[PDB]
Amino acid sequence: MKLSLMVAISKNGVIGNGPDIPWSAKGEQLLFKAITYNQWLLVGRKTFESMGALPNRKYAVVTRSSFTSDNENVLIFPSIKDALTNLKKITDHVIVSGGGEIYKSLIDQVDTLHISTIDIEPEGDVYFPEIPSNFRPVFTQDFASNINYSYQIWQKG
Amino acid sequence: MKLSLMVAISKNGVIGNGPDIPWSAKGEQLLFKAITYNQWLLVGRKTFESMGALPNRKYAVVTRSFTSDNENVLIFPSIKDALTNLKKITDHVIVSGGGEIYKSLIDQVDTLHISTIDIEPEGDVYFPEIPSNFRPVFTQDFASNINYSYQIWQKG
Ligand SMILES: NC(=O)c1ccc[n+]([C@@H]2O[C@H](COP(=O)([O-])OP(=O)(O)OC[C@H]3O[C@@H](n4cnc5c(N)ncnc54)[C@H](OP(=O)(O)O)[C@@H]3O)[C@@H](O)[C@H]2O)c1
Numbered sequence: 564m565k566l567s568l569m570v571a572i573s574k575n576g577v578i579g580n581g582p583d584i585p586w587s588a589k590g591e592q593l594l595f596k597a598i599t600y601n602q603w604l605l606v607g608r609k610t611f612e613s614m615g616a617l618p619n620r621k622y623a624v625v626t627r628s629s630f631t632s633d634n635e636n637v638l639i640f641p642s643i644k645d646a647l648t649n650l651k652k653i654t655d656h657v658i659v660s661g662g663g664e665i666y667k668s669l670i671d672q673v674d675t676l677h678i679s680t681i682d683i684e685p686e687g688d689v690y691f692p693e694i695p696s697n698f699r700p701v702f703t704q705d706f707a708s709n710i711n712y713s714y715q716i717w718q719k720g
Numbered sequence: 721m722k723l724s725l726m727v728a729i730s731k732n733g734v735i736g737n738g739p740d741i742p743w744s745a746k747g748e749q750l751l752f753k754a755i756t757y758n759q760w761l762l763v764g765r766k767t768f769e770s771m772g773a774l775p776n777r778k779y780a781v782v783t784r785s786f787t788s789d790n791e792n793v794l795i796f797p798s799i800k801d802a803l804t805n806l807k808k809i810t811d812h813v814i815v816s817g818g819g820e821i822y823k824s825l826i827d828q829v830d831t832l833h834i835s836t837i838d839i840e841p842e843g844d845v846y847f848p849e850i851p852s853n854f855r856p857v858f859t860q861d862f863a864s865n866i867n868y869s870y871q872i873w874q875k876g
């Protein structure tokens with residue numbers, strides 16, 4: 564099973580401010596929608612609650628509490644180990660989709676990074692982890708918008 | 721200025737049937753929307769007539785005849801003139817079809833965005849051979865009503 568990771572990181576490293584993404588870069592959300600269409604997303608419970616079960620995605624959510632959801636496209640796991648064990652029986656690809664805790668847990672395990680660098684320095688208290696030295700960018704594209712952003716794909720090895 | 725190219729190719733090589741793309745692969749259009757957002761698109765006149773001036777894109781349309789009063793659409797008399805003028809205002813253009821424009825520009829583009837669509841349709845518009853100096857650098861498969869696979873190639 565392949566693990567991808569997709570995130571939008573502002574220029575000071577902030578990805579979140581409490582429950583919010585502290586910016587709106589019009590058009591960048593299209594990248595996220597396109598890459599996650601009909602994919603399995605691995606998300607922390609906090610991010611899952613902020614995003615909801617958007618249509619045409621499948622969600623593996625990790626929680627330490629009794630969190631539940633009766634949506635048939637949502638599977639809830641009590642650990643990341645259990646999530647990954649179960650996911651590899653049912654899919655060949657999972658996209659790690661946040662938030663800070665889940666990114667920090669799994670950054671050393673993922674194969675492909677989708678990073679949109681957002682041209683803003685917002686307030687916030689959630690940051691992206693350091694990127695292991697063995698990742699290299701293989702694709703870059705710049706976008707002008709209300710907040711500019713640059714989309715880069717990194718490959719491991 | 722860098723040139724990209726974006727296309728969806730069916731399993732038997734068809735990209736069009738007259739003025740239409742002969743499939744509807746739910747989800748694949750999201751890739752096209754995402755990569756072209758606020759970009760300059762170079763398109764042939766026939767493709768521009770089939771797609772129209774969709775919001776949040778800028779169009780360089782080539783014709784030997786045809787006009788548009790849309791402020792986001794530029795009409796050029798040649799691909800050469802389109803490229804000469806685009807380099808004055810942007811560092812990136814996306815070649816977005818159709819068959820004639822792909823054939824004329826494939827040897828000049830730096831990055832390919834190719835979605836392979838799992839259907840074998842009828843049609844009469846095709847895509848050129850990928851030049852041998854291109855290498856795939858990213859691939860992802862999608863299951864949908866018609867499956868599709870997305871691949872980015874870089875010129876080396
Ligand atoms: N691209 C972006 O910019 C982007 C992408 C995603 C989200 N975000 C932001 O990131 C923030 C949320 O990130 P976050 O770090 O605070 O929380 P998070 O990673 O989304 O979720 C944290 C929660 O997941 C559960 N969890 C974490 N590790 C676990 C483990 N090993 N086993 C079992 N459960 C585990 C716990 O849920 P329980 O509390 O239920 O036990 C934890 O409280 C938001 O601001 C959000 O907007 C930004």
Ligand SMILES: NC(=O)c1ccc[n+]([C@@H]2O[C@H](COP(=O)([O-])OP(=O)(O)OC[C@H]3O[C@@H](n4cnc5c(N)ncnc54)[C@H](OP(=O)(O)O)[C@@H]3O)[C@@H](O)[C@H]2O)c1
Binds near residue numbers: 765
């Ligand atoms: N991803 C996909 O599957 C995809 C993407 C886009 C398009 N398509 C398909 O491709 C088909 C259209 O392709 P096509 O080859 O027939 O037409 P096209 O490439 O879209 O346009 C051809 C016309 O562009 C003008 N032109 C071509 N070369 C020129 C040059 N060097 N200088 C000035 N003008 C030039 C001419 O316009 P005038 O006749 O006005 O002189 C020509 O008739 C449609 O089926 C469309 O659906 C498929």
Ligand SMILES: CCc1nc(N)nc(N)c1C#C[C@H](C)c1cc(-c2ccc(C(N)=O)cc2)ccc1Cl
Binds near residue numbers: 571593596660677
């Ligand atoms: C577009 C932001 C982004 N960009 C990149 N590059 N990577 C990422 N991981 C994310 C993200 C995220 C979290 C998961 C999220 C997403 C959403 C959400 C809701 C609706 C839409 C839509 N199009 O309607 C889009 C996104 C809401 C809250 C959160 Cl917390």
Ligand SMILES: CCc1nc(N)nc(N)c1C#C[C@H](C)c1cc(-c2ccc(C(N)=O)cc2)ccc1Cl
Binds near residue numbers: 727739816834
């Ligand atoms: C999505 C298909 C695709 N995929 C990839 N990978 N590459 C490509 N170049 C294309 C294409 C195309 C031509 C240019 C086109 C596009 C459209 C059109 C109109 C509206 C929307 C929308 N807003 O949903 C989307 C597409 C209509 C006719 C044509 Cl002839």
Ligand SMILES: [Ca+2]
Binds near residue numbers: 798799800801
């Ligand atoms: Ca020409």
